[PDB]
DNA sequence: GCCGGTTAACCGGC
DNA sequence: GCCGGTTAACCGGC
């Protein structure tokens, strides 16, 4: 992580702040590590600048050099074609990262998270699990395990003001621990500071390690649901 | 419908959500009729102060199936004295005479966008609510109808889903297993009893879950199932 | 503690 | 046309 060495100032300064914090976050990155520091679409347009030659959807899509990189980062193929010096690409809520880091060609894909602990705790969707299984499917089927990390930064507040954070990264949990709550869009869902962090093996490891639990978890969903929405409702059908 | 009579008078000449003037309009028109979920539960409520127990202020809905839709839960009922506008609410407005009930949402469609159907209800819920509906021979205590609203206000919309066909209903499971469907697009040729809705909205609901649990198998499964 | 259903909408592939 | 996955979080039952 580009942002671990540096992520105990991140919550001195922080802790005391006065929902998106993330704003705060990004000025703060863009402060201490500016040439690595970009928002996603920014990176994109960024790209495509460097290139004012390719234009085209399909062109503009080779630029990535890594069919996982273009899955994680590009937008929809109209988009991409219609993106011009002028037409340029904005925000997006859709868009992986929150904030990107870049250096090397090594991607840390960032998000941040905020909680409001006056609340009663509640897991919030962190992921979809099936966007998760096609990455995970992608790192293999081209083996690109050594370029982009996906971590999380929470900022915990109250009635608005911080009071504390938290710091964990996906591919330093246990992927047979991640809970995917199926019907919330079947996101894996968890608060950063319970997030395990713990694993051993490598990055191929994990990904293989993940889908085992995708499919097994799809596997358990598919009977679940036979158990949960078609048997206790087979009474009311003659 | 409550509104359907006056769902001409809606609409005149005018001159984010549009769901504010859609209230006052009936409250103005149907005031003794009108009310806002939260408005109506302080109500039942206010109407009754010798009750405090939680599974007292709950037997008042003298309805299981009404319970069911309307309750706020224990918690939230043992503490009131206020009750909040929460958007969990089954509906935004209600509409009772003579112990029946309209339960309407009102939503609002931003015309200009690439029209991309909208979250209505839970299917789930819809299913437990046929149950309740069914086991307690309720097929003439409430409706569940629908009032759209376009803008870019360029039109508007008005569908009682008991009046459409279930087996039309498309259940998006990954969407928190909610239908989805624009107003202006719901079916609206239903013929049958009420009872006769439920049970065949069951038979839609089972048959969609199955669909589902398979589908699960194709798409989440057998593609990753080689490594 | 443990557990998972619900908001209001919103694209992009083919 | 036709189809369905994604946001950012949020809460009550036993």
Same mark, same amino acid.
């Given at each position: 992580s580009f942002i671990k060495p540096i992520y105990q100032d991140i919550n001195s300064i922080l802790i005391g702040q006065k929902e998106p914090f993330e704003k705060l976050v990004y000025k703060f990155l863009k402060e201490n590590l500016s040439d690595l520091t970009f928002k996603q679409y920014e990176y994109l347009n960024d790209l495509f600048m460097k290139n004012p030659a390719i234009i085209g959807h399909e062109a503009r899509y080779k630029?990535?050099?890594s069919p996982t990189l273009l899955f994680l980062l590009s937008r929809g193929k109209a988009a991409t074609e219609n993106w011009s010096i002028e037409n340029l690409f904005e925000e997006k809520? %859709?868009? &992986?990262?929150?904030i990107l880091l870049v250096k090397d060609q090594f991607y840390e894909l960032l998000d941040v998270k905020t909680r409001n602990?006056?609340?009663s705790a509640f897991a919030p969707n962190i992921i979809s699990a099936y966007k998760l299984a096609q990455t995970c499917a992608k790192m293999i089927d081209n083996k690109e395990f050594d370029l982009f990390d996906i971590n999380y930064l929470e900022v915990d507040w109250e009635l608005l003001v911080c009071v504390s954070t938290s710091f964990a990264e996906l591919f330093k949990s246990?992927?047979?621990?991640l809970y995917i709550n199926?019907?919330?869009?079947?996101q894996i869902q968890f608060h950063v500071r319970d997030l395990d962090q713990?694993? %051993?093996? &490598?990055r191929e490891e994990w990904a293989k390690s993940y889908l085992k639990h995708f499919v097994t978890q799809a596997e358990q969903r598919a009977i679940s649901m036979i158990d949960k929405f078609v048997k206790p409702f087979k009474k009311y059908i003659l």
């Amino acid at each position: 992580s580009f942002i671990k060495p540096i992520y105990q100032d991140i919550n001195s300064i922080l802790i005391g702040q006065k929902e998106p914090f993330e704003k705060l976050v990004y000025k703060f990155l863009k402060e201490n590590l500016s040439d690595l520091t970009f928002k996603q679409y920014e990176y994109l347009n960024d790209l495509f600048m460097k290139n004012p030659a390719i234009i085209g959807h399909e062109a503009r899509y080779k630029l990535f050099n890594s069919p996982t990189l273009l899955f994680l980062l590009s937008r929809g193929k109209a988009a991409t074609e219609n993106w011009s010096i002028e037409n340029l690409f904005e925000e997006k809520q %859709n868009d &992986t990262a929150d904030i990107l880091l870049v250096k090397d060609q090594f991607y840390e894909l960032l998000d941040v998270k905020t909680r409001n602990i006056s609340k009663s705790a509640f897991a919030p969707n962190i992921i979809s699990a099936y966007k998760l299984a096609q990455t995970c499917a992608k790192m293999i089927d081209n083996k690109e395990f050594d370029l982009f990390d996906i971590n999380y930064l929470e900022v915990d507040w109250e009635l608005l003001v911080c009071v504390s954070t938290s710091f964990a990264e996906l591919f330093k949990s246990e992927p047979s621990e991640l809970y995917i709550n199926w019907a919330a869009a079947m996101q894996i869902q968890f608060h950063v500071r319970d997030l395990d962090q713990g694993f %051993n093996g &490598t990055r191929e490891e994990w990904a293989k390690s993940y889908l085992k639990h995708f499919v097994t978890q799809a596997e358990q969903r598919a009977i679940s649901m036979i158990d949960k929405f078609v048997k206790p409702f087979k009474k009311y059908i003659l």
